[PDB]
Structure formats: structure tokens, C-alpha cells
Symmetry: C4
Subunit: 334 residues, 4 copies
Amino acid sequence: TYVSLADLERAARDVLPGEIFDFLAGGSGTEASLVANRTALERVFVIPRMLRDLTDVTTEIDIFGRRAALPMAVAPVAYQRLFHPEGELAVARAARDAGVPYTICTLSSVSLEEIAAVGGRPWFQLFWLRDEKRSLDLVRRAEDAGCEAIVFTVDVPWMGRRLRDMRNGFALPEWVTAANFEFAPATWESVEAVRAHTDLPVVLKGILAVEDARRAVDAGAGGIVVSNHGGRQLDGAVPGIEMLGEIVAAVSGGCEVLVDGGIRSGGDVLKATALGASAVLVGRPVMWALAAAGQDGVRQLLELLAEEVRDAMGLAGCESVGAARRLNTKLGVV
Amino acid sequence: TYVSLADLERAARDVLPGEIFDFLAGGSGTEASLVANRTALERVFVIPRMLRDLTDVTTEIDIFGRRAALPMAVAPVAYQRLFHPEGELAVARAARDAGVPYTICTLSSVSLEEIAAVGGRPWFQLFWLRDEKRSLDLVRRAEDAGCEAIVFTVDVPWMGRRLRDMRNGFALPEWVTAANFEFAPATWESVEAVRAHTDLPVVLKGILAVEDARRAVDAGAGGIVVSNHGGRQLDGAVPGIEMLGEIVAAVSGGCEVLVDGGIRSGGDVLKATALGASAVLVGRPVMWALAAAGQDGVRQLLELLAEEVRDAMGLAGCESVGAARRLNTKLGVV
Amino acid sequence: TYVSLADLERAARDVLPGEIFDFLAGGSGTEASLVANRTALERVFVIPRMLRDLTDVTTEIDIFGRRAALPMAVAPVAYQRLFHPEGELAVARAARDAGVPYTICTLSSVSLEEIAAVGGRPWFQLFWLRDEKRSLDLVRRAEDAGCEAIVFTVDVPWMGRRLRDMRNGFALPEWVTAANFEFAPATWESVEAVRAHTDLPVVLKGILAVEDARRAVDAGAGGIVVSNHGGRQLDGAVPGIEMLGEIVAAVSGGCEVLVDGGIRSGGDVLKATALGASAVLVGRPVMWALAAAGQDGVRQLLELLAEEVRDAMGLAGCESVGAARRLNTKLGVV
Amino acid sequence: TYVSLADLERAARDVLPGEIFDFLAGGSGTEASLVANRTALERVFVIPRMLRDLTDVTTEIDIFGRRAALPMAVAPVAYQRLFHPEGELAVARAARDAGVPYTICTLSSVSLEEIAAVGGRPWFQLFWLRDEKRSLDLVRRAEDAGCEAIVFTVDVPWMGRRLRDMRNGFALPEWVTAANFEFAPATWESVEAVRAHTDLPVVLKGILAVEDARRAVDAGAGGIVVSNHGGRQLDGAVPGIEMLGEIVAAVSGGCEVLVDGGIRSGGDVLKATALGASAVLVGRPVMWALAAAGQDGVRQLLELLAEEVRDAMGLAGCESVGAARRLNTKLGVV
Ligand SMILES: Cc1cc2nc3c(=O)[nH]c(=O)nc-3n(C[C@H](O)[C@H](O)[C@H](O)COP(=O)(O)O)c2cc1C
Ligand SMILES: Cc1cc2nc3c(=O)[nH]c(=O)nc-3n(C[C@H](O)[C@H](O)[C@H](O)COP(=O)(O)O)c2cc1C
Ligand SMILES: Cc1cc2nc3c(=O)[nH]c(=O)nc-3n(C[C@H](O)[C@H](O)[C@H](O)COP(=O)(O)O)c2cc1C
Ligand SMILES: Cc1cc2nc3c(=O)[nH]c(=O)nc-3n(C[C@H](O)[C@H](O)[C@H](O)COP(=O)(O)O)c2cc1C
Ligand SMILES: O=C(O)C(=O)Cc1ccccc1
Ligand SMILES: O=C(O)C(=O)Cc1ccccc1
Ligand SMILES: O=C(O)C(=O)Cc1ccccc1
Ligand SMILES: O=C(O)C(=O)Cc1ccccc1
């Protein structure tokens, strides 16, 4: 039995090799942005409403054309076979059964067509390749396989400096490969090339500046993920949760606005929603559950998060996610 | 001898079984709101006034028709026989002798008519039952027994997630029962049904949003308790003390405005009064005193709090509680 | 050799009995205001000026008619024979030799006439007695003995709750007495009675509210000490240093504005001056020096503080205390 | 291998004698300003931009007439032979090879002409001597030797109180001398005397007040260093990083505005640039590298900093230092 997401982190540290746990847990540089993602959520307090009708509380949302059971998707995390032998297939099967979208990675350790064949709501995360034609081919493969959205990661012109990995001399085991297979920095021109070559919604992941959110809408994005990449890219980048309210105001409903970084409970989902997010992504906790107990571990994590989101929404007087977005918040200390 | 409320917490932890201490002390989730109730009070500093006439300092107030000896009532705490064999009768007798109102719980472990027969100023706390007729019958019983106010708890559509209890596998011992005897979420319609069926003042406990305080006045409430339920309901709910000043301004004298959560000294009572509260509720410390020494323990706690309130008021230049409400405050760090 | 005021606190804790150290060090209640006096000073940063003429840096000020060598006086501290057999005479002799005013206490353990005969700049601190005629007699004695100012303590309608003393069962040894010999709360009427019966400047010690500072000027006070009594009176009273700037602005030069609480270095003196103080009082450190080494210990403390004040002023570009009062400040974190 | 500047501090503490490590690491007084330099940088978060052209990212700047490879110079640090037998020559050779300006100190342990003969971009740091004619002779020597800028230190009318040194009884070993050879406080008149006697840009180091930055431009300075002298001068002086944005706005492009104090990574360089600095100085880390490994240690430090600056700039969407100065920032907690 697991009663919080923190129970799963302890289970995963026992089972995984140290250097793989460090690859999962770590950030870039001094890990200032990794810690700040948690500090920022801990400073937000919700002002709940009372005495509202809760006869039919629902945690469902509609996003990118489809119903999802929670305002949550599994974040893209590369190389999931590092954590469990069934890797991405275990996570995708659990996400499908929970009604949660799963983001298939460009650097998945099982091919995107195999993961898409599990069913559910697969999205596909794109890293730009040095060849525009090859980049567009991955997009076309994902679309042909039934992925519903292209999550274009825009905060990785190159990878950040993971000092835990450097100190550990970490490298991919020979038994893990990039099953979909030279990368290059993406620009606004790359976004337009993707947008022109797919009918799927393009979601830009890694936006933090208000004018980049506005330009994303102008560029035809269907969504953005407000994110500092889990503290793994620029060390010292502001947490997404601290930019979210200002970005939601600036886009004025022109695209979906997701957030990630440090979501560790249903109450954290409520905080993100109250600051204006359409939905959240969850990364590390899903891998903790995968490492601890495979598919069934991910299922249990998603069941726990669903219960915690429903509990927080109802205690805050919200019969729907839209009502949660109209909650007010107040910043505290520590 | 006890010289602070903290002396009593140590005494209670020695005597009570661990799982009962945890039921008393704990909050929901990560206990963020439980800790924030204390952090928020610790950040408030009073600006005392000097050189005023203190010849007749009095801590008395008039509330809901009657004089009380302090601006304080005993909060509703379910199942007091968990803490001492005389349970609610011990606490009610001490409250009566101290001139403090005592709130009888819907989930009391001694019947409401027995506790009311102790005398004093009994109030009655209502949890809404799935049957409107049954809810109104508890209200009628309380009124017929001489309770003076109905404290309708409005922040419990269901109970929060008490992880200490889950981890402990805590359950009520067979020797403790709900001596007044299926609950359902209350709405504004339930408030109107109560208001229409009693002449007693109805006090809504668990209000945190300014518009819910305004609606409470519009709904005919005689008072509200600004409260996050001791951090036991929504984890991440703002402390009542952080909303109190804005709520007092918005109701403009239209009802009494009480606060609870973390009051641990007479100086904390002064802080709440200076932020505009009409009175406070005190929960956990009363149970510490009950566990440590029964009726006499509660008597000693209330005598200590009375001395500390009188001391703080006089040192701040206040000959009455109304003068304390006109004190100014300044927020500090830590 | 002592290179900071903290060296002296360690020396005093070694020599004094625990219960006397606790009487000296402690505050009221939870000691929130005692700690806040230090936290508040630690949050202030000075913006120094460069490239100014420092050919004749002087730390002298004129106050209450007389030159003082530093913008500093020894605070009133009762019963100095608790700390060293020569008690007040040792401290007064060192203050005289350093050119610092010394405040003789109503509760001195050597008579006020003996301490005044040491010479120097004696001020006299008054606690109001239940008999107006007796209060005025102490004032007359002080004036006849050559005291230069009456420091009327206005924050003690009664003594605060010193929990260290209660826990220690602390009482005055039989060998310490109130050598000047039933007290009562002072009011604005008591201030007028003192003002009408002396030509000396009357200084109200313990003012924290801006309107009480304004009323003090209206009442004919020659000065005020902005002070929470070293955290020994109302627990939760704001630190004087946090009210000082607003009070200096409100009195508009109408009286001298001193501050106390937590001054532990020449840099702290500079901070107080930059926030607008005319001078500071220093309490506990003087007693540490007395306990550690008697008269010579106090001399060494005052020499160290004089060097630190001169050093801080010059490094901040200030050739006079008036220039230091025109420095700007910026609040930081921790 | 060193992967952060913190790796070098540990290496230097192992090798150096304790009292020399303390001379290097320490600040004045309670070291409040030393700690605040780090706290202030840790509170700044960058808002990175995405999707910009990074084809030709360059870290170069033009300053005082010449290209530098990074927006960084080696700060003046006296007596470098305390840390390694080759002292200043080792550091200057590494700075030259990295394309970084090196500031030669008035109190260098190798003569200024020897260090200038290494080549590179030498600047010269001036302490004002009691004799105007002698001060101007050091300036003339530096100019004749090929130094490119005069860095006039304006925050040392005398040295601050280094309590670590006092406690250690620290003194210069007989084998270290002031190889360029009675000092006096500098004033605005001294600045004019220097400005009139050289064609080199005069840079005032140690400015914190906005009006002193404005007066520096009016006085003909080519630059200023916004600095509290590494926390070694006035204890309680505000960190330069907290004044930088307001100073950059007030000088309106009238001179170069550098900053120092606590720069420990390329991300810290990015923060300073985003707050408006033209370049930074780095002091203690260069000495850590010198102590740990001589010339090669300094080379490795400068290579690590160059990689970290390039990494942070690109991750923040900046192809040039000018673009980094247009980044926005947001203050956080801890
Ligand atoms: C081990 C690991 C690998 C990741 N790989 C990718 C990736 O391939 N593509 C991507 O866009 N984000 C990647 N991310 C970032 C996540 O999508 C997400 O932004 C971050 O993990 C969210 O924060 P959380 O882990 O705090 O929930 C990775 C994160 C981790 C921890
Ligand atoms: C053990 C326990 C049981 C409680 N039971 C009730 C209850 O039956 N009804 C209710 O309205 N509040 C209940 N409360 C909340 C209290 O009335 C009160 O809001 C909270 O304890 C006040 O904070 P304090 O304990 O910090 O003083 C309970 C609190 C505790 C600790
Ligand atoms: C042991 C002790 C005794 C004191 N006695 C008096 C007193 O008799 N009269 C008075 O006005 N203040 C008294 N004070 C308060 C001081 O004058 C002063 O306000 C406080 O000590 C200043 O703070 P500091 O000790 O932090 O420097 C006393 C303080 C201490 C610690
Ligand atoms: C050991 C030491 C000696 C220094 N000597 C000088 C000096 O001779 N002249 C000067 O202007 N600054 C001197 N400084 C100050 C530095 O130039 C610089 O302002 C401070 O070290 C920068 O901060 P950082 O060390 O945190 O990078 C010295 C600093 C240190 C630590
Ligand atoms: O995006 C991330 O943070 C990743 O860790 C993705 C990744 C994983 C392994 C190699 C390169 C990028
Ligand atoms: O209101 C609370 O916090 C309670 O703990 C009340 C309660 C106690 C036991 C079972 C259900 C509700
Ligand atoms: O003013 C104070 O804080 C004192 O401690 C004065 C004092 C000392 C001893 C008894 C009563 C008052
Ligand atoms: O400027 C500093 O902080 C120095 O430490 C310079 C210095 C070094 C040794 C003696 C005097 C000044």
C-alpha cells in the first residue's frame, strides 16, 4: 500500500542502482532550479470555497480533442527501460487503463509504433534533428501510428550539465537503446515546419517567458508546457509554476497552458489548476512507480493521484476542473 | 505547575497511546496547513500602546447573547473519551467553571443532553446528515437541551486524508461510540434549512474565502469561524489567520468573526483580536490538558490562558477586548 | 583580548550562575520578541558612500544639553550587583571614563546618590510608584544629585512573564537590595506630573506606536526610546528597529529618538543611525562585560564599541553621526 | 577533473595552511556581507528565452578598447605568492592564455612590470598613497608598462576588521613582500588627479550608492565596479548584485558597469549580465585554482567558467552577451 507519492520514491531508491537513481533524480548545475520547483509549490496556498454542490464531482477534462480522466499526462522521460525491463510499455499500459495521456519520447527505449499499439491517448515528444527532413519523418511516423499531439521540446538546444552523471561517469547500459533510430537546436522556423506538416496540435514544451508564450500562440501552437525541464536544463531558470499565472493571462485562452515540475500530489495538481493550468505533466514519480513495481506500480500511482485530485477538488468546493481554475490562491512563507 | 501551553503537550504525549496522540496532533496530506497555522501566527507582531488607563482591565466579551469570561471558546473535537475516561463531561465542567463556552460535537462520546446538563454556555456543532429531517432533529435536540448557538461545520463534505491514521491503522476503540446516535455534503440550501428551523444564532465554521464570508452574512449567519479545520481538511488550504483581516473588513460588522488554528497562548489570542477577531476557538491544547489531568487539567489550562490574555492585553495598553481589536500589527520574518 | 561583543557573552556565561545568566539573557513568553530584535537588525543592510572627506571623523553627538563620545548610552538594567560585587559603581565609572551616559535605575543595587557621585553623565530611569508624591520624590532626588535626564519607562504597567525565571524559581539573593528604598501603571497624566515637576528633559522609554511617539512630543517629552524592553515585556511586540524609521518621520525633529534592543556591534549602531536614531541604548552586553571583568571589562567593551563605530562610520563615508543618519538602507533576507 | 568551482575550494582548503585559507576566505565583522553576496545571487532566477538562432554563440565582449573572451576579469587580490610560489605570474599567464583581463594589484607580490611583461590584457588596481605624487607615479608606471585601465579602489579609506586574521594572529610571511615598493583615504579630488594624469580609462571599484555611480560618470570614470569588496570592508554593506539593476538604470550607458562578489559559476555570470552588468570580476575562486594547481589550475578554472558561461547563455537563448543583458529575472525565496 502507498498513501503518498513519497512512499514510491523510497521504494524506487531501494531497488535502483545508485547511478540510475541519480540520472532520474538529478538536475543541472547546483540543482537550484530542481529544488525551486518544490519550494515554489510549497509556497502556494489555496483559498477553498464551501457549501457548493458536489453531487457529480468529476476530474475529467477535454484536451486536444479527447477526454482525459484527470488534468494530467505522463511527461516525456527518455529511456524507460533503465527503470524496469518492460519500460515504456508498462507505463503506457497503466496510463491507458487510467485514462491518462502518455507522452512517447523521441529517445524511447521501445519503438514509438510498439508503444502506440498499446492504445490509449499517446502523444509524441519531438527533439529536433539536424536534418529537417528526418525531423518531419519522426513526426509523420507518430501521426501514422495514431499519436494525437506533437509535444515539441523547445528548451534543449543541447543538454544541460548533469553533475551527478559526470561524477558517476554515467552511461547508457548496452541493453538500452534509442529504439526509434544527430540533434540540432530548434528555432521558430522549426516550429513552423512542424506546424505545416501535421494536422495534429503542436505543443511547445519548455516555455517560461511571457513573450514566448504569446509568440507560441501567434505561431499556431495548440498548447504550451510552462516548464524548466525538471531543473535539468538551465540551472537558475525560474520554476514554471512561478510564471504560470502571468502566462495564462497573456495568452487569453489562445492555447492550452500546461505546467510541470515537482507535481507530487493531488493537492499540487489543484494548486496548478488554481494558478490557471489546463493540466499538468508528471515525470519522476511515474518512474519511481515503474521502478518499484512495473505496470502495477504505475497503476497504483495513478489510482492514488486520481483519489488525491478528487479529494482536493471536493474539499475546495470544485465540482469540475473549470471550477478549480477559478479558485484564488495566496503565497505564504516556507 | 504549567507555565505555558507547551508544558501540557509534553504531558499529553507521555500519557496517551501513540496512535491516539497521532489522531489528535495530525493533519491531512503533508501537514502543510497544520504547520502553516503556526507559522502564520509567529509572523504577526503587535504594535502595543502605552500609558493608557488599566484600572479595570477586563477580558470579557458579549457574544451570541451572553457574557463570556475570555474571547475564547473550546473548539468542537470529536470523541473526547479517547483522551480521558470522563471525556466531554470533564471538559464541559472546566469550561463552565472558567466562564468559557464549550462546543458540544455531533460526534461526542457522551450524549449532547448529558453534556448540556453540566450547565455553562454550551454551543452545539452540527455535521450535516444525509437526511435533512434527521439533521434538523439534532438541531432541535440541541436547542431543547439549552445550547445557545449552532456551529455548522461547512468544510467537511467528507473527511480529509489523515496519513498518520492510515499508517497507524487507527480505528475507534470499542469503548468509544458516537453517543448522539450517515453524513452528506452541506450546501447553502442546508444552511437555509437550519436557519429556518431555529431561533439560535447559526455560526458557519470553516470559511476562508472573502465571498463566502459575505454570503454567510447574506444567508443570515450570526457568525463565522475563519478556519482551515486545524490543517485536517484540505492540505494546502490557507490559514484562517491569513484571511481574517480581509474577511473582517468585508463583513463590516454584519456577523461575529471568530478564528481558529494554532492558538497556543494569550499572546496568540491578542494577535487574533488585533487582526479583528471577535473571539478564538482552541482545540488541541484543551485535549492535551484533558489527557494530562482530566477536569483539573482543563481548569489549569483555562486559568493559564486567562492570565496570559490579561497580561498581553495590559502590556499592549488595552483595558478591553474592543481596544485590542483596534491595535495595529506588522508582519515579520520567521 | 576581546574582538567582538560575542566574546564577552561567552566569558559571562562561564562565570555567572545559571539562574543569574538566565535572568539577564531571557525574555517573556516564547522569547519571540527577544529573537526578533536580532533578526530585524540582521535584515538591514547599509548603502555606504565613498570618496568623502574623512580627515576629522568624529563619533560625538550632543544630546540633552551635553556632548557624548558615541551615539550610545548604557541602558537601565536593574540590580547590577547580581553580576559583579561592585555592580553599578563599576559600570558608571567605566561609562564616565568613556564619555558615555549611564542610566541609573530606580531598582539600582547601589543608591542613586552614590552612583551619581561617580560623575560623568548620569541619567535616571523612573518606574512609577503607586504614590504620585513618592514618584516625584525620586525624580527630585535624581535632579538634586546631578542627573541630567529622566528616562521614564512607560512599557511596564507590570512585569512580563519571564518563563526562565519561573522555571528556575529565581529570586533576588539576600545580598542584593533595591538601594533607593509599591509600583503602579503609569499614564499620560503621570508623564505630565513628572514634566511639571522637573526642568530636566523627560525621555519616554518603551514607545512603539507612531501615534504614541507623536503624543510624546505633544506631551513635552525631550526624547523617546523606541523599544520592546529587550523582549522582556509583551511577547510578540514588534522590535523597535522595525518602527524606528516611521517614528522618526512622524516626529519631524520634535524630540530625540533613541532605539534599543539587540545592539551588538558598531555596525549595529550604524544601522540604527542610518534608520534615523539619535543614539542607541545597550543593555545585556554591558552586563556581560561587568560579569566577566568588572570595571575594566566594561571599559574594554566601550573601547571596542568606540573602535567599531568609528570603523563603520568611516567605511560608510560618514565624518559625523549626522552624515550617518542620511545614509540609505536596504532590507535583505536572513 | 573539476566540474564546478566548488571542487576547487575543497582542493585549496586541503593544501593551504589554515591561516592563509582564512585570510583568503574571510570577511569583516560577523561576515554578514560575505554571506549576503551568495544569498543574493541564489535568490535571482533567470527567465530564459527559447527558439532563437544559436548558430554563432559567442561569449566575447569589447571593454575599455579591447576584446575579451568572456564577460569576466580576474579581480585584484593582494599578495598572490601567499597561495603558490609563482603567485601573480601563474595567474596572469593563465588569464592571458584564456583571453581574460588580469588586474595587477598595488600590493602585488611580484612587481607590476614583471606581471605586465607576461602580456595579455593587464589592468592595474590603485590604492591611494598618502602622497599624491607617489600615487600618480604608480599610475604612470602602470601606463608605461602597458596596463590598459586603472582600477581605482574607492572603498578602502582603511582596511576592514578581519576577525579571522585577528584571532589567528595572521601576518605576512617574510618571503612575501609588496614588490611594487603609506596609504591614505581617497576622495573625489584624488579621482580627478588620476583622471587628469592618464589617458587610460579610470574604473572606480567599490561603488554601491546610486548617486555615487552617477557622480562617477560625471567625474569622467570609464567604468565602475559595483562591489562590497567581497564582504571584507563594511560588515553590513549591501551586496553589489542587489544595487546593480538600479545603478545600471541611473548611469544610462554613461560608463561600463561591472559587478563582483560571490560569482561561482557561469550561471552566476548570466545572472549578473541579466541584471545589467557589462562584466564581472572573480576573486576567491581564482586563488583556489592557483593554490590547488598553479598556472594549470587557473587555466582549468577559466576553461570551466568559459564552458559554463557558453552553456548558460545558449540554454537561455542568448547568442551574445548583449542578448543576455536583455533577459528578465525574477526573485525567489532561498
Ligand atoms: C530522467 C528524465 C528524462 C527526461 N527526458 C525528457 C525527454 O526526453 N524529453 C523531454 O521533453 N523532457 C524530458 N524530461 C523532462 C520531463 O518531461 C519533465 O519536464 C520533468 O521531469 C517534469 O518534472 P517532474 O519530474 O518534477 O515531474 C526528462 C526528465 C527526467 C527526470
Ligand atoms: C482530534 C480533532 C477532532 C476534531 N473534530 C472536529 C469535529 O468533530 N467538528 C469540527 O467542526 N471540528 C473538529 N475539529 C477541528 C477543531 O474544531 C479546530 O478547528 C481545530 O482543532 C482548531 O485548531 P487547534 O487544534 O489548532 O486549536 C477537530 C480537531 C481535532 C484535532
Ligand atoms: C536584566 C535586565 C534588567 C532590566 N531592567 C530594566 C529596568 O530596571 N528599567 C528599564 O527601563 N529597563 C530595564 N531593562 C531593559 C533595558 O533597559 C533594555 O531596554 C534592553 O535590555 C535593551 O536591549 P539589549 O539588552 O538587547 O541591549 C532590563 C533589561 C535586562 C536584560
Ligand atoms: C584575499 C583577498 C585580497 C584582496 N585584495 C584586494 C586588493 O588588494 N585590492 C582590491 O581592490 N580588492 C581586493 N580584494 C577584493 C576583490 O578584488 C573582490 O572585490 C572580492 O574578492 C570579489 O569577490 P569574490 O572573491 O567573492 O569573487 C581582495 C579580496 C581577497 C579575498
Ligand atoms: O530531457 C532530459 O532531461 C533527458 O534527460 C533526455 C535525455 C536523456 C538521455 C540523453 C539525452 C537526453
Ligand atoms: O473534524 C475532524 O477533524 C474530526 O476529526 C472529526 C471526526 C472524527 C472522527 C471521525 C470522523 C470525523
Ligand atoms: O525591566 C526589566 O526587564 C527588569 O528586569 C526590571 C526588574 C528587575 C527585577 C524585578 C522587577 C523589575
Ligand atoms: O583589499 C583587501 O581585502 C585586501 O585584503 C588587500 C590587503 C591585503 C593585505 C594587507 C592590506 C590590504
